[PDB]
Amino acid sequence: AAEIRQQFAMTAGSPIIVNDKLERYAEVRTAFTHPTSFFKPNYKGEVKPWFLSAYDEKVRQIENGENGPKMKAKNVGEARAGRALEAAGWTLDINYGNIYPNRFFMLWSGETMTNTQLWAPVGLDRRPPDTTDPVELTNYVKFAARMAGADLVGVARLNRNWVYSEAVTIPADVPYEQSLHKEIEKPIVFKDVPLPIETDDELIIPNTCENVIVAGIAMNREMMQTAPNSMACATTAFCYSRMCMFDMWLCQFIRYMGYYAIPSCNGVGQSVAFAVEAGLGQASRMGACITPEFGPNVRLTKVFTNMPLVPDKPIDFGVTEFCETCKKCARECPSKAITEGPRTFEGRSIHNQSGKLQWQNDYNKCLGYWPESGGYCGVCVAVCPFTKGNIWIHDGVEWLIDNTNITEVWDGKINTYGLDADHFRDTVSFRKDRV
Amino acid sequence: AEKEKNAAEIRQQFAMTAGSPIIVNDKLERYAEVRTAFTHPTSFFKPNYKGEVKPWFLSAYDEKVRQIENGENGPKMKAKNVGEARAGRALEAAGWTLDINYGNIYPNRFFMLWSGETMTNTQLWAPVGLDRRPPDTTDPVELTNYVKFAARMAGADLVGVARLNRNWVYSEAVTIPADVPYEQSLHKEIEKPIVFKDVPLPIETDDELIIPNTCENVIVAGIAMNREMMQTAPNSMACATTAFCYSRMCMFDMWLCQFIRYMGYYAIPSCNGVGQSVAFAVEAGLGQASRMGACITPEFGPNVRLTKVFTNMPLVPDKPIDFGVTEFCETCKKCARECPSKAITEGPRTFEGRSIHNQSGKLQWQNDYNKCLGYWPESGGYCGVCVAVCPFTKGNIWIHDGVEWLIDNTRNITEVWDGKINTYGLDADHFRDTVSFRKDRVK
Ligand code: SF4
Numbered sequence: 082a083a084e085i086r087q088q089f090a091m092t093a094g095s096p097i098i099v100n101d102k103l104e105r106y107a108e109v110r111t112a113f114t115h116p117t118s119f120f121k122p123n124y125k126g127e128v129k130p131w132f133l134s135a136y137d138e139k140v141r142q143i144e145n146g147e148n149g150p151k152m153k154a155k156n157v158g159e160a161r162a163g164r165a166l167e168a169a170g171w172t173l174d175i176n177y178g179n180i181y182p183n184r185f186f187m188l189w190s191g192e193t194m195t196n197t198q199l200w201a202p203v204g205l206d207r208r209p210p211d212t213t214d215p216v217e218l219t220n221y222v223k224f225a226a227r228m229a230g231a232d233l234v235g236v237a238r239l240n241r242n243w244v245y246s247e248a249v250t251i252p253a254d255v256p257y258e259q260s261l262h263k264e265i266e267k268p269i270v271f272k273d274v275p276l277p278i279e280t281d282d283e284l285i286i287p288n289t290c291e292n293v294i295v296a297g298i299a300m301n302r303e304m305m306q307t308a309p310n311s312m313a314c315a316t317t318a319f320c321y322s323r324m325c326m327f328d329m330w331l332c333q334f335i336r337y338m339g340y341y342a343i344p345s346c347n348g349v350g351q352s353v354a355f356a357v358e359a360g361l362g363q364a365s366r367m368g369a370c371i372t373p374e375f376g377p378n379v380r381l382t383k384v385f386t387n388m389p390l391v392p393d394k395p396i397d398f399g400v401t402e403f404c405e406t407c408k409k410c411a412r413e414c415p416s417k418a419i420t421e422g423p424r425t426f427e428g429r430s431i432h433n434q435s436g437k438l439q440w441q442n443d444y445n446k447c448l449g450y451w452p453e454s455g456g457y458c459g460v461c462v463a464v465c466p467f468t469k470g471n472i473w474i475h476d477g478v479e480w481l482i483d484n485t486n487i488t489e490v491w492d493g494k495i496n497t498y499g500l501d502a503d504h505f506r507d508t509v510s511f512r513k514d515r516v
Numbered sequence: 517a518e519k520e521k522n523a524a525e526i527r528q529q530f531a532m533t534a535g536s537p538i539i540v541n542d543k544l545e546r547y548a549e550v551r552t553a554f555t556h557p558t559s560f561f562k563p564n565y566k567g568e569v570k571p572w573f574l575s576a577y578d579e580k581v582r583q584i585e586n587g588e589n590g591p592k593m594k595a596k597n598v599g600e601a602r603a604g605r606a607l608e609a610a611g612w613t614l615d616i617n618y619g620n621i622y623p624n625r626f627f628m629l630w631s632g633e634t635m636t637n638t639q640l641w642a643p644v645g646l647d648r649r650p651p652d653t654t655d656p657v658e659l660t661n662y663v664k665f666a667a668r669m670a671g672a673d674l675v676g677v678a679r680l681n682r683n684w685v686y687s688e689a690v691t692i693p694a695d696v697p698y699e700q701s702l703h704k705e706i707e708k709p710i711v712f713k714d715v716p717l718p719i720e721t722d723d724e725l726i727i728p729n730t731c732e733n734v735i736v737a738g739i740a741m742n743r744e745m746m747q748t749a750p751n752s753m754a755c756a757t758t759a760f761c762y763s764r765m766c767m768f769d770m771w772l773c774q775f776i777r778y779m780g781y782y783a784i785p786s787c788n789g790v791g792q793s794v795a796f797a798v799e800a801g802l803g804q805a806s807r808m809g810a811c812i813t814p815e816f817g818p819n820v821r822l823t824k825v826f827t828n829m830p831l832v833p834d835k836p837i838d839f840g841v842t843e844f845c846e847t848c849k850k851c852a853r854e855c856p857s858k859a860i861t862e863g864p865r866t867f868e869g870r871s872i873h874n875q876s877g878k879l880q881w882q883n884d885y886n887k888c889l890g891y892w893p894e895s896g897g898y899c900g901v902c903v904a905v906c907p908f909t910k911g912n913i914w915i916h917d918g919v920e921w922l923i924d925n926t927r928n929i930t931e932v933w934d935g936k937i938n939t940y941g942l943d944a945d946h947f948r949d950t951v952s953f954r955k956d957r958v959k
């Protein structure tokens with residue numbers, strides 16, 4: 082896997098092609114939050130917040146002994162178990178994605194955390210850094226990242242084009258039980274200040290915030306292959322909580338090294354663009370970052386920091402050319418959300434950011450399928466050739482890409498965090514591949 | 517030819533018939549948690565390197581600070597430079613992010629809630645009613661398979677089930693009143709009885725922590741530490757793998773408790789609180805007790821952390837295992853010889869506690885745990901030399917002789933930072949050993 086990555090390393094420079102129309106994107110425009118897409122009917126035809134209508138379908142499926150849309154479970158007990166596993170997975174995640182910045186788990190300073198308080202006498206977060214060498218810092222922080230649950234880790238300079246212009250958040254003193262009903266918009270701005278700070282009016286990231294560290298958190302292949310049914314939902318959910326723990330662990334490490342760190346999970350900016358710039362993978366037709374190790378079957382989170390670091394090289398292992406002819410996700414998508422046409426700089430709707438060259442998908446169609454199916458779908462991820470274990474072959478001199486139920490999952494292979502020992506060697510790391 | 521390792525085969529070979537293997541007599545009473553060296557007034561205070569008497573972890577902090585300033589990764593162990601010393605301690609500190617006051621011991625506080633009702637996840641999911649709907653599965657065989665699958669998703673490297681032996685549940689917990697904020701927690705610790713009563717649900721009153729009489733089972737998880745890091749004991753990287761695994765324990769408990777609740781049962785998390793993990797682990801078949809006092813497992817030796825969840829969910833208990841640990845420990849004594857505090861006995865097992873920190877009435881090697889704790893401020897960490905030098909901690913201890921499996925009786929920090937690592941510090945060279953199919957989850 083390390084050989085594959087070195088082989089497809091490209092020269093420095095963001096591979097995302099942009100034009101002069103590109104503007105930063107307000108987070109409220111995503112299909113999850115925008116008022117034009119937020120409300121969906123349930124199976125009874127009642128208009129509700131999309132996730133409430135989706136809950137109605139989960140209840141309906143459990144009652145009827147189903148694991149998904151038109152997918153009968155072995156029995157009601159099995160149906161129940163899948164949704165219990167899904168719901169439990171989300172334990173360390175707020176309101177599907179931890180997007181409110183500097184709230185709950187996503188604090189921009191460590192000062193009030195119980196861990197920081199307990200460790201205060203050592204003064205690790207107050208002491209000036211003892212290492213400023215970006216080479217050594219990159220090795221340290223990547224080692225820490227792996228301890229913190231990343232299966233992949235990369236570094237990029239922070240491209241502000243992918244930072245949301247405005248965040249969706251809640252007022253600071255609103256407790257959790259009012260959060261869903263009191264969501265607001267708040268600008269994210271860059272200023273000459275020493276530390277990340279939030280005011281009544283603004284989320285302020287310092288101009289010194291040079292870098293972004295991006296983590297890939299691998300999902301389980303067997304469970305995702307059940308998309309759009311419940312076990313796909315469960316591997317999705319568990320990985321969101323793994324993302325949260327990753328962000329908290331790594332931000333604390335960085336702070337204890339004498340720098341600042343901003344967590345994000347699904348908030349603050351666009352993870353796919355950061356991941357491509359940090360060399361985890363390449364953008365794809367479906368819109369995900371496709372990695373050599375996992376294809377698109379991997380979640381992303383990221384941490385922003387002033388810690389000096391060595392940016393990784395972007396990687397090009399031919400995804401763009403492959404997606405050009407493939408279109409399997411587009412054909413299998415249950416909502417016809419994914420385009421079969423060519424890449425353009427023009428967004429198909431409010432949910433897309435115009436001004437960058439990408440495949441333009443209709444993401445309101447995608448979200449529409451979630452209440453209908455009672456899950457987070459994932460069919461595109463499941464059917465992508467890159468998701469399958471072996472797409473890689475060797476032609477004698479260099480690596481190249483090859484041209485060509487749920488009861489069973491519960492009774493089948495599993496290992497810690499859903500990782501697969503058959504492939505786990507692919508993410509082994511020594512100093513040579515960290516920096 | 518070398519037999520491909522089969523960890524499941526190994527466990528089958530050494531499976532015992534049913535019955536708690538811990539030998540006890542009439543001396544045995546439940547143990548008050550306040551008696552542990554961490555909490556007992558006789559041991560909680562330790563001098564620092566200036567001879568100032570402080571809480572043990574504060575004296576240990578003084579030594580970490582001194583070491584960083586002196587460019588050291590441990591007692592009389594020079595680091596590459598001050599930056600490396602700093603990094604080890606930053607890693608250690610960060611590892612503890614999801615753990616309260618070194619162990620999460622206060623029951624029904626912070627992360628260790630005995631009910632899910634107030635958790636943000638529960639509130640978010642409330643309209644589905646998973647925590648209100650009666651169980652759809654009561655078959656212990658299916659439940660055992662479901663809950664073990666969930667346990668692996670939740671980060672357990674090992675999982676086992678036992679009937680709950682109340683002998684190992686603390687008579688009284690250490691906790692804080694419910695109106696005390698975190699900042700005052702260490703100042704305001706109290707004792708509170710853990711009692712069993714005829715109630716539908718785990719509940720806490722002003723006077724008591726009440727576990728229902730229906731709380732039949734304990735689920736025990738092993739959380740694997742990283743071998744390379746632990747073998748730097750007593751230096752900083754051993755402290756770091758210890759720390760990260762405590763946060764993994766916490767995540768495990770919360771994940772699994774929520775799964776069980778959403779299956780229509782109740783679940784009590786614990787991490788280092790509520791009861792004695794090693795006893796539960798032995799009874800749930802994760803491994804065997806040892807001279808040093810830890811549960812030694814076939815997969816990781818003693819280099820594995822433990823947590824446990826208590827529940828009324830019907831389950832199939834696992835069988836205890838005997839792969840010869842007791843007999844090896846009788847003749848080995850390596851941990852005893854290498855222990856920097858001489859805390860571990862070189863003598864035979866007895867039923868009589870060495871001091872207040874030991875629970876009398878059960879046959880075990882009796883160690884002086886006040887001596888152990890005393891070395892922690894001296895070394896500026898959580899030591900772990902015993903775990904590091906234990907032959908069972910070594911990676912390739914199992915061999916096959918053509919007939920059966922057996923133990924192969926043949927048995928710096930810059931390099932660790934520059935060396936092999938993988939997700940959560942797990943090792944792909946061995947990760948196949950914890951693969952699981954239905955057959956090894958339930959008979
Ligand atoms: S399914 Fe085919 S077109 Fe779609 S993202 Fe994967 S490789 Fe690209």
Ligand code: SF4
Binds near residue numbers: 415418448450460
């Ligand atoms: S998640 Fe499902 S509906 Fe959405 S784009 Fe992928 S295949 Fe289509």
Ligand code: SF4
Binds near residue numbers: 906
């Ligand atoms: S070092 Fe030897 S005596 Fe001590 S626990 Fe390990 S096997 Fe037993």
Ligand code: SF4
Binds near residue numbers: 858860887901902903
């Ligand atoms: S942790 Fe260290 S001091 Fe304590 S028993 Fe083990 S070797 Fe001895």
